[PDB]
Design a protein around this ligand. Structure first.
Ligand SMILES: CC(C)(C)c1cc(C(C)(C)C)c(NC(=O)c2c[nH]c3ccccc3c2=O)cc1O
Length: 1179
């Protein structure tokens, strides 16, 4: 059978009306050629009347009476014919929509009904085969996609074929010669599109690869930002970013030639094939057979059929997606095992049920998503035993609990029963005989008594009132309004843990159960209600058949037999007194267990007025490219005019002359004007996309502060804004020239053409164009005004579906199943009533959308008839009104297509505005006099408080003052690593101190030029920023006030010990490492990071964190570089593993932002405070 035979399944009239709607769609397709036919039929008659009026004419007014009487007699019969086709399309439109909404709805209601019930009759396999929430959500929307998968798309497919083949049958019958040419050009247009797609593709690939390099050049440089600021490499990296965008600017400009030429060639094939068909068509009259006038309008109906099949393709593509998501997951609705638990079957266990014995279990994990981790379990319980399990071990004991039901059934080992087996028996009785107590009861609610009744659906209030007492739930059912029928939200969203627990114990007791079973049930309770719950779980046991598991060895002694499970298998089996007399494994266990929505405006115009290269000739080009399109209709009007009303004189020469004019004027100009319009806005966008990207990336690379402290930013996410905004703003250029073009193809030429209308054709144009624009703008609202309300009826009906399965301990009561289906039988009924209603609404609006075609033709006939005919009827300008209506329909589509490409581009403008206005924290200041006498300085700190760029991370530095002298070490340690690290990272200016300040001596580092500061500061990175440059550059990523030379790369290699690598390899300083450093271990990377500080002679030096992940060589040969990098130069080092850096002339202990001890290392080893207490725990 077909896949669609399973979608359109069951029912009677539910299937039969699909045939009625299919027949309506066929007739609605055949009506479109018949509307073309009559305008042709009039053209045969008018080509006779009009030419006889120039050829053996009855004077020049008796023809205007005798011939015109027959024309208005005929037009009075035509007034029946086109009105009958009009009445037809109004009816079949509503019958087609009645199929789409009401016949589909007659299946889709029962499909949704049996879908919610199919989760319930999936019984066990719903737990294994994907997961709750999403499996319910995708299925809930995919059974909505089935509506299109059986609906309108199938109608549109048959309707377009009926227009196509119906038009072709008439076009063969009246003149197959031209109808064969319409077949022959279709593969040529398809081949042209088959070139256009390759031209669009294999230029964009290279534009993407050119940009991908500019992306990677931004990403690593922004991640490394404060280090690239400290080296000075911005003078290299800003041009690496620029030139990869110059390559993209060499590529996009060539696509802006080739794609525009390939579209112009497709337009040229259209103008040329139409012109050749017209000239061949009149040659098949004034020489030859199989033409007249009407045949041309018949051949145009075949082209309307090809357009109708084009309009069907997006509906067939939507139908392919409606096959898509729905038909595969339809197997989880049915073709699943579907019976697995025996949900409404089985004979009763009238051996009372109780006498279980598990044997040689090796079973699966629950849901089979994890492997069978359990190996070895055997376990007894018999009628008149509390068996208590000891040796608790999580999932490896919880499997034994979930195996107590038709939810998991053993395969790896067995259960044994003293009678008929528990896998075979009555599943409702099996749910209700046991009180199955989990610490968390995941349960749907509405009242407390209804939640208790979700244990067993047959109850009396006399059972309920005892159940709330003996579960000890009575305290809150006395405090709450309406008591046991007190109102509560879904999942119990107004109840604490111990309250839900005592309600779930009442939900057990109301069964009159014989057995108690406990999923570790003392765990996760509140310590008030844990005791009140234990007293309820003791009250729930009349000296009777129980299987208890708990973290408290109280309920384990409130019992009859211990069963011990150190790992797996039963190791001990005796009384709690016995295993404490004889002091076994139970006694061993007793000894341990007792985006920017404010879219911008105005400023955008002055910004683009600063960005753009003023190619204003593209505006003139868009105007003339628009005005050329109605000139096709002017020359075609002149062909119809001379052919209907010239008489025979010169006709073959007039047709040949107008053919030559038509072919040349459209083929030459339209190609050039589309090409030059596309190539002008393309080149404007090539400047804009490059110029914006350079300015915003340069702005980012001059503001880390107030943008990397943003928890709402991510480096790659900013690189997506660099991707998207610079492309969206490019689309926001060419679309505006397309809006200029369509205005001139429409009213900007159409009103000038109306200066030669006899007012009747102006009334015709004005009666149609705004009304068809209003119709589509209403049709929009009619559709969307259902869909939002349909979604909210479905959403409310979805909450009560997910609440039926996430609340999985409702499958452990199983009698609420058909009560949920009873809720769904009313809930699915409100959107189905909405669907029955909208079948009329869409019926009348889609019917009115046909009525405008009858009205258009009927007005065009009845505004020429009699009143213009008496003058001689206008053999011109009638065609121009229809072309202006087509340019009006084109205009509405062109303008509404670019509406989101206003809105998105105004959001991209808000993103661009934030980043061009910058953060003023890392710029070229000059209030502090830059003095050379203090490159090493005497760095003063005073009153200092600091909180990290992660802004919630507390003011961790708190009132500090310190100094470090010219050439001195200042080693820092402190109670949580923040007391040391913040002092380096504020001197980096990677954030400002919120109070206090820091000074080079008597002049402020908050006010010193950040690039002068970053000329004297060296900084050691935990990770070297790395593209595959030479080793020389992979030390020296630029310099802020120096010149890199042989001597500095010698010092930086030798002092940092990294010359171990550089003097060894091929090429020495020239050689390679790959992006991120393919052969660079931690020890090499930190020795490179030391070299990067040293290669500019750093008069002040900063060692951020004195080990990364280092040990052995990789640590001690790094310390052998740390000691060589400090001393004689003003060096701050934040001590980590104190068995790296303890060598310093001064150390300071910064406890929670204040000094607690200080001195040289040996003076602090004497101080028996914090420092010696931090040494005396490292070793
Ligand atoms: C916005 C909305 C409601 C989806 C809508 C819009 C239009 C436009 C804007 C193109 C008139 C249309 N129009 C069309 O699809 C068509 C417009 N002009 C034609 C001219 C000749 C042959 C077919 C069409 C056509 O299908 C239909 C709509 O349903």
């Amino acid at each position: 059978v077909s896949v669609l035979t399973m979608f359109r399944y069951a029912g009677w009239l539910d299937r039969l009306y699909m045939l009625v709607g299919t027949l309506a769609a066929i007739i609605h397709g055949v009506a479109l050629p018949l509307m073309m036919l009559i305008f042709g039929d009039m053209t045969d008659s008018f080509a006779s009347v009009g030419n006889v009026s120039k050829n053996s004419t009855n004077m020049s007014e008796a023809d205007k009476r005798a011939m015109f009487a027959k024309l208005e007699e005929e037009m009075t019969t035509y007034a029946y014919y086109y009105t009958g086709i009009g009445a037809g399309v109004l009816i079949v439109a509503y019958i087609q929509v009645s199929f789409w909404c009401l016949a589909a709805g007659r299946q889709i209601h029962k499909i949704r009904q049996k879908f919610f019930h199919a989760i319930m009759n999936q019984e066990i396999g719903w737990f294994d085969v994907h997961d709750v929430g999403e499996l319910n959500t995708r299925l809930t929307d995919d059974v909505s996609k089935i509506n299109e998968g059986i609906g309108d798309k199938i109608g549109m497919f048959f309707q377009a074929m009926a227009t196509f083949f119906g038009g072709f049958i008439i076009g063969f019958t009246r003149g197959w010669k031209l109808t064969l040419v319409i077949l022959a050009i279709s593969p040529v247009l398809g081949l042209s599109a088959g070139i256009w797609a390759k031209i669009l593709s294999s230029f964009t690939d290279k534009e993407l690869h050119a940009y991908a390099k500019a992306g990677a050049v931004a990403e690593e440089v922004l991640a490394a930002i404060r280090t690239v600021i400290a080296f000075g490499g911005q003078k290299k990296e800003l041009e690496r970013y620029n030139n990869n965008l110059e390559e993209a600017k060499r590529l996009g400009i060539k696509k802006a030639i080739t794609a525009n030429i390939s579209m112009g060639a497709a337009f040229l094939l259209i103008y040329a094939s139409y012109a050749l068909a017209f000239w061949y068509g009149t040659s098949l009259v004034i020489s030859k057979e199989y033409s007249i006038g009407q045949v041309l309008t018949v051949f145009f109906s075949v082209l309307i059929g090809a357009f109708s099949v084009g309009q069907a393709s997006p509906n067939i593509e939507a139908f392919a997606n409606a096959r898509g998501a729905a038909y595969e997951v339809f197997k989880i609705i049915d073709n699943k095992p579907s019976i697995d638990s025996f949900s409404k079957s089985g004979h009763k266990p009238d051996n009372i049920q109780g006498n279980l014995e598990f044997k040689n279990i090796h079973f699966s994990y629950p849901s089979r998503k994890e492997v069978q981790i359990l190996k070895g379990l055997n376990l007894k319980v018999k009628s008149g035993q509390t068996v208590a399990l000891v040796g608790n071990s999580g999932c490896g004991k919880s499997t034994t609990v979930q195996l107590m039901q038709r939810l998991y059934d053993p395969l790896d080992g067995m259960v044994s029963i003293d009678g008929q087996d528990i896998r075979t028996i009555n599943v409702r009785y099996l749910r209700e005989i046991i009180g199955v107590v989990s610490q968390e009861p995941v349960l749907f609610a509405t009242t407390i008594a209804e939640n208790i009744r979700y244990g067993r659906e047959d109850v009396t209030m006399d059972e309920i009132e005892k159940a709330v007492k003996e579960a000890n739930a009575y305290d809150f059912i006395m405090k709450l309004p309406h008591q046991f029928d007190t109102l509560v939200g879904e999942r119990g969203a107004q109840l604490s843990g111990g309250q839900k627990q005592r309600i779930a114990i009442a939900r057990a007791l109301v069964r009159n159960p014989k057995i108690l079973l406990l999923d570790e049930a003392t765990s996760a309770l509140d310590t008030e209600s844990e005791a009140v719950v234990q007293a309820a779980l003791d009250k729930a046991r009349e000296g009777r058949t129980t299987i208890v598991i708990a973290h408290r060895l109280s309920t384990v002694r409130n019992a009859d037999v211990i069963a011990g499970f150190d790992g797996g298998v039963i190791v001990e089996q005796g009384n709690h007194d016995e295993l404490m007399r004889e002091k076994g494994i139970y006694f061993k266990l007793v000894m341990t267990q007792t985006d920017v929505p404010p879219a911008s405006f105005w400023r955008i115009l002055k910004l683009n007025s600063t960005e753009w290269p003023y190619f204003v000739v593209g505006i003139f080009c868009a105007i003339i490219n628009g005005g050329l399109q109605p000139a096709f209709s002017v020359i075609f009007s002149k062909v119809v005019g001379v052919f209907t009303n010239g008489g025979p004189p010169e006709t073959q020469r007039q047709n040949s002359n107008l053919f030559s004019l038509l072919f040349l004027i459209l083929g030459i100009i339209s190609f050039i004007t589309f090409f030059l319009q596309g190539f002008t806005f393309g080149k404007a966008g090539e400047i804009l996309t490059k110029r914006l990207r350079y300015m915003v990336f340069k702005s980012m690379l001059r503001q880390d502060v107030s943008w990397f402290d943003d928890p709402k930013n991510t480096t790659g996410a900013l690189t997506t804004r660099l991707a998207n905004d610079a492309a969206q703003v490019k689309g926001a250029t060419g679309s505006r020239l397309a809006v200029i073009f369509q205005n001139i193809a429409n009213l900007g030429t159409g009103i000038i053409i109306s200066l030669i209308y006899g007012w009747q054709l102006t009334l015709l144009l004005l009666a149609i164009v705004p009304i068809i624009a209003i119709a589509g703008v209403v049709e929009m609202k009619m559709l969307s005004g259902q869909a939002l309300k349909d979604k909210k009826e479905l959403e409310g009906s979805g909450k009560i579906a997910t609440e039926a399965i996430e609340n999985f301990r409702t499958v452990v009561s199983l009698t609420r199943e058909q009560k949920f289906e009873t809720m769904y039988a009313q809930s699915l009924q409100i959107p189905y009533r909405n669907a029955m209603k909208k079948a009329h609404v869409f019926g009348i609006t889609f019917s009115f959308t046909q009525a405008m075609m009858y009205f258009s033709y009927a007005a065009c006939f009845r505004f020429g008839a009699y009143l213009v005919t008496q003058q001689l009827m206008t053999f011109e300008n009638v065609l121009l009104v229809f072309s202006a209506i087509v340019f009006g329909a084109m205009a509405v589509g062109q303008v509404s297509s670019f509406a989101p490409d206003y809105a998105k581009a105004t959001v991209s403008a808000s993103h661009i505005i934030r980043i061009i206005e910058k953060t003023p924290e890392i710029d070229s200041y000059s209030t502090q006099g830059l003095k050379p006498n203090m490159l090493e300085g005497n760095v003063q700190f005073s009153g200092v408080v600091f909180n990290y760029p992660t802004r919630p991370s507390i003011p961790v530095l708190q009132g500090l003052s310190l100094e470090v002298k010219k050439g001195q070490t200042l080693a820092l340690v402190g109670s949580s690593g923040c007391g040391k690290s913040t002092v380096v990272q504020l001197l980096e200016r990677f954030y400002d101190p919120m109070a206090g300040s820091v000074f080079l001596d008597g002049k402020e580092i908050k006010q010193l030029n950040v690039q002068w500061l970053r000329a004297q500061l060296g900084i050691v990175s935990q990770e070297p920023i790395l593209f595959d440059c030479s080793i020389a550059e992979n030390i020296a990523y630029g310099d802020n006030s120096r010149v890199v030379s042989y001597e500095e790369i010698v010092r930086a290699a030798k002092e940092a010990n990294i010359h171990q690598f550089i003097d060894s390899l091929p090429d020495k300083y020239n050689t390679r490492v790959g992006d991120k450093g393919t052969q660079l271990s931690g020890g090499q990377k930190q020795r490179i990071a030391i070299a990067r500080a040293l290669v500019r002679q750093p008069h002040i030096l900063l060692l951020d964190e004195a080990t990364s992940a280092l040990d052995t060589e990789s640590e001690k040969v790094v310390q052998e570089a740390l000691d060589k990098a400090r001393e004689g130069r003003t060096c701050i080092v934040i001590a980590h593993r104190l068995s790296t850096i303890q060598n310093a002339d001064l150390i300071v202990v910064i406890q929670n932002g204040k000094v607690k001890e200080h001195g040289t290392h040996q003076q602090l080893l004497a101080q028996k405070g914090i420092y010696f207490s931090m040494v005396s725990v490292q070793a």
